[PDB]
Write a protein that binds this ligand. Structure first.
Ligand SMILES: O=P(O)(O)O[C@@H]1[C@@H](OP(=O)(O)O)[C@H](OP(=O)(O)OP(=O)(O)O)[C@@H](OP(=O)(O)O)[C@H](OP(=O)(O)OP(=O)(O)O)[C@@H]1OP(=O)(O)O
Ligand SMILES: Nc1ncnc2c1ncn2[C@@H]1O[C@H](COP(=O)(O)OP(=O)(O)O)[C@@H](O)[C@H]1O
Ligand SMILES: [Mg+2]
Ligand SMILES: [Mg+2]
Ligand SMILES: [Mg+2]
Ligand SMILES: [Mg+2]
Ligand SMILES: [Mg+2]
Length: 318
């Protein structure tokens, strides 16, 4: 048997989408799936972790990525989502740097790095209706994002002409994804990316790749619109149908390859007749799409077989 090891925090490994996909991969006659226990991941040395031939491992809050890297170096499995790239995906600055290097359209942006010790000595000038970051001018509306990609306190600043103030986004709490604040001035502590607001029809497009030649997309109400989450009867966020155009399919191909994450989620803003990437999340599955589960498992199984069937002397055809 070819062993596929799944290495992540239990919150992820035991999530319903993961279980749905893993039972389908387990359908491959020559593949056995082994899910690494969180207790083992956290508390055992990598030398004691289970063996695998193919490793699906991904960082989320609390995950010891240093251990995952050392395990991969020790055992040399075929790695589905590259582990070292997952350090970079945690830093919005690194993500945007990569997108630019790949000729991928993204919002015009500027980075404000702040020395916590001297927080006023950085390159920011603020007016009522604009900021200037390293000399670069952002008129309101603009977006302010923490440089840590794991910090979801993204703020949007409204122009005087629209009543000023700001929209404060956050990880969803029940029925809310954001709140309006009368505060008009930007945050005074922390490092931030400042970027142009891209006007959309009021939805985000979420893209989920499984390798460079497959991408599923769906839309949802922009969390900044008023912050009330649209929920269905099962308490799931309302998702709308999307089909990616030829340009967007190429974006997905580029993102998947550039970040070396076979399974990769990212966000598109359809604005001004083009599509801009504003966020790259790495490993992410679609929730509540049976067809996605079927396709994702099929593709991952095929990738595994294509790569490893020869060395195991197993017949494999495309
Ligand atoms: O906090 P994390 O980053 O470790 O996990 C979050 C991550 O899931 P992942 O592991 O990547 O599959 C989000 O997807 P993502 O990667 O596109 O992230 P971005 O926001 O673009 O960066 C997801 O938002 P969404 O895409 O479903 O709206 C969010 O669901 P949640 O707010 O609960 O949404 P509801 O289930 O209440 O509707 C998860 O929060 P928690 O599960 O509470 O931890
Ligand atoms: N430049 C932008 N223009 C318009 N809306 C944006 C822009 N950047 C982020 N947003 C909105 O804010 C939301 C959260 O920002 P995002 O970069 O995806 O951060 P997070 O990592 O917290 O998901 C996006 O889904 C989108 O609705
Ligand atoms: Mg099997
Ligand atoms: Mg949640
Ligand atoms: Mg991918
Ligand atoms: Mg996002
Ligand atoms: Mg993540």
């Amino acid at each position: 048997q070819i062993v596929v090891g799944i290495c992540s925090m239990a919150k992820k490994s035991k999530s319903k989408p993961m279980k749905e996909i893993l039972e389908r991969i387990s359908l491959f006659k020559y593949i056995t799936v082994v899910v690494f226990e969180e207790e083992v991941i956290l508390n055992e040395p990598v030398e004691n972790w289970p063996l695998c031939d193919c490793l699906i491992s991904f960082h989320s809050k609390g995950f010891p990525l240093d251990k995952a890297v050392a395990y991969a170096k020790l055992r040399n499995p075929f790695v589905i989502n590259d582990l070292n790239m997952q350090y970079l995906i945690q830093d919005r600055r690194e993500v945007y740097s990569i997108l630019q290097a790949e000729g991928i359209l993204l919002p015009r942006y500027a980075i404000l790095n702040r020395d916590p010790n001297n927080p006023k000595e950085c390159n920011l000038i603020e007016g009522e209706d604009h900021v200037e970051v390293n000399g670069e001018v952002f008129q309101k509306p603009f977006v302010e994002k923490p440089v840590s990609a794991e910090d979801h306190n993204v703020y949007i600043y409204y122009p005087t002409s629209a009543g000023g103030g700001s929209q404060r986004l956050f990880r969803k709490i029940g029925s809310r994804s954001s709140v309006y604040s009368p505060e008009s001035n930007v945050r005074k502590t922390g490092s931030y990316i400042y970027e142009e607001f891209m006007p959309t029809d009021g939805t985000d497009v979420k893209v989920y790749t499984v390798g460079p030649d497959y991408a599923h997309a769906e839309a949802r109400k922009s969390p900044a619109l008023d912050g009330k989450v649209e929920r269905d009867s099962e308490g799931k966020e309302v998702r709308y149908p999307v089909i990616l155009n030829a340009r967007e399919k190429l974006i997905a191909w580029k993102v998947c390859l550039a970040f070396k994450q076979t399974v990769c989620g990212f966000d598109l803003l359809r604005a001004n007749g083009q599509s801009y990437v504003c966020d790259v999340n790495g490993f992410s599955f679609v929730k509540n799409s049976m067809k996605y589960y079927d396709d994702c498992a099929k593709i991952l199984g095929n990738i595994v077989m294509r790569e490893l069937a020869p060395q195991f002397h197993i017949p494999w055809s495309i």
